[PDB]
Ligand binder design. Structure first.
Ligand SMILES: OC[C@H]1O[C@@H](O[C@H]2[C@H](O)[C@@H](O)[C@@H](O)O[C@@H]2CO)[C@H](O)[C@@H](O)[C@H]1O
Ligand SMILES: OC[C@H]1O[C@@H](O[C@H]2[C@H](O)[C@@H](O)[C@@H](O)O[C@@H]2CO)[C@H](O)[C@@H](O)[C@H]1O
Ligand SMILES: OC[C@H]1O[C@@H](O[C@H]2[C@H](O)[C@@H](O)[C@@H](O)O[C@@H]2CO)[C@H](O)[C@@H](O)[C@H]1O
Ligand SMILES: OC[C@H]1O[C@@H](O[C@H]2[C@H](O)[C@@H](O)[C@@H](O)O[C@@H]2CO)[C@H](O)[C@@H](O)[C@H]1O
Lengths: 135, 137, 135, 137
């Protein structure tokens, strides 16, 4: 991948009915960043990928899932409450349907593409960790 | 009536000095017309009234900033960036310097120069937003 | 009172089934500090008052309630996980019986001395605010 | 078996430099004999293994600190202050400098000098404690 790998967490043990809050500083001048959740690096239930400019996307959020290292079909959100070099916060509610809380107060649904009962893997790409909290 | 906001928390003796920041998280009242976070020395003397308006007065999805001295409002500054949804959580961070910086949750900042001399912000209030947390650094 | 008044919060609207977490820096070299919860300054459901040295108490927590400015009967805890000039954290679970979570993992019960359904008043004395959060 | 702790979170690519601190909140496993928070470059090379022991080996209600290089443990440092209860939440803060400072939740600090040269802590692990939050400053 092109992005700079930042923090990874393994053995996260995040079960359904719980949420993860990710705060961090978006890389200055970056084209895109991502927060990934899943079972391991090859198996992502949620790849949340705001793009300043990448591929055909400009100030768009791409969401996707990855199974055995193959990407599923992208879903795209046009709301874009981000600025590179700035702090941001994303909250992920883990249920049968994931809810991504954007920092502008919008909630984006993303249904689980594959059955999963525990998220053990979390990764940050092109965003420097400030804090991660689970509730 | 609805031209008035419901008072939420008031914090006194905040002792926020220049070179420091305050972070406010809270849940915006559902269906509300506007909400505010106010900073100053007391309710009559505000160095920064940060008032996002969903619909109020002539303003639609617009941030109004102002100051208040001796209970009289000064000139409004308006910002068109509007990263808020009523009924949702939000976070505003205020960097206290000679020029206040209002960090919006979409990563934009709004400068707001101190309109009167002030060295300590001791008063912070929330209106039409329910406290989740307040942090100082 | 002798202690330095630090932050006060009014209109806190803390209902039963919820908790407040108070982080702060204990005044350097201080004799005691307190976190107070109640309906207003004259009416405290919980005055949590760790004493380094005050009155007959040395490295003891005094808990009390105050009604119309008159103190009730003190309850005292000997566990003393505090150091003056240092950061600390106290968590208060609001129920019919308040639970004070000390930073050493101990939970101290304090029953409500008077009927109260909302805590609207919070005060810090001889401790400088770092953060207050409600859940 | 019970001489081994259950692995909890592992964080890699932490990029913690000197002059900065990491704060770890978590819930200590109920009934457990010991728990640990480890800092270093990987699991074989630890600049600080902070291991409060309820009862383990010759140690009762004692903090064991050590370092590990090339998967070999160095000399244990023991601290008698023990502000922990199994099954409860706890918070440990680590200030990374030439001398690490371990801030215990009772307000005591434990110095732990760097036993080998290190400029970045990239690995952080929790054993017999369930993550609540990790924060860097
Ligand atoms: O679906 C998420 C991944 O997208 C990959 O990029 C896609 C791109 O989004 C699409 O427009 C088309 O161009 O093909 C690209 C490569 O398959 C990223 O490279 C990857 O990192 C994910 O974000
Ligand atoms: O400037 C902040 C205060 O505005 C007051 O309303 C203004 C209004 O914004 C303006 O368009 C005109 O109508 O005058 C009003 C009175 O000064 C709000 O009433 C007040 O709560 C502040 O937000
Ligand atoms: O009960 C809490 C209040 O105690 C007052 O001090 C008591 C003291 O604890 C007791 O030993 C006896 O000496 O009388 C004192 C005064 O009534 C404090 O002054 C007050 O601030 C509370 O902490
Ligand atoms: O020094 C940290 C490691 O200690 C290991 O156990 C020690 C034990 O503390 C000591 O008393 C003696 O029994 O030798 C043992 C082996 O080095 C733990 O097994 C290990 O997990 C660390 O905590």
């Amino acid at each position: 991948m092109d992005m700079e790998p930042d923090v990874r967490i393994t053995n996260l043990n995040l079960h359904k009915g719980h949420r993860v809050e990710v705060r961090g500083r978006i890389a200055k001048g970056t084209n895109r960043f991502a927060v990934d959740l899943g079972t391991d690096s090859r198996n992502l239930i949620c790849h949340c990928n705001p793009r300043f400019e990448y591929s055909v996307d400009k100030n768009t959020i791409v969401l996707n899932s990855k199974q055995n290292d193959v990407w599923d079909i992208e879903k795209k959100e046009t709301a874009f409450p981000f600025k590179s070099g700035s702090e941001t916060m994303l909250i992920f509610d883990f249920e049968d349907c994931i809810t991504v809380h954007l920092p502008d107060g919008k909630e984006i649904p993303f249904t689980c593409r594959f059955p999963i009962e525990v998220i053990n893997y979390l990764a940050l790409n092109n965003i420097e960790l400030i804090s991660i909290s689970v509730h």
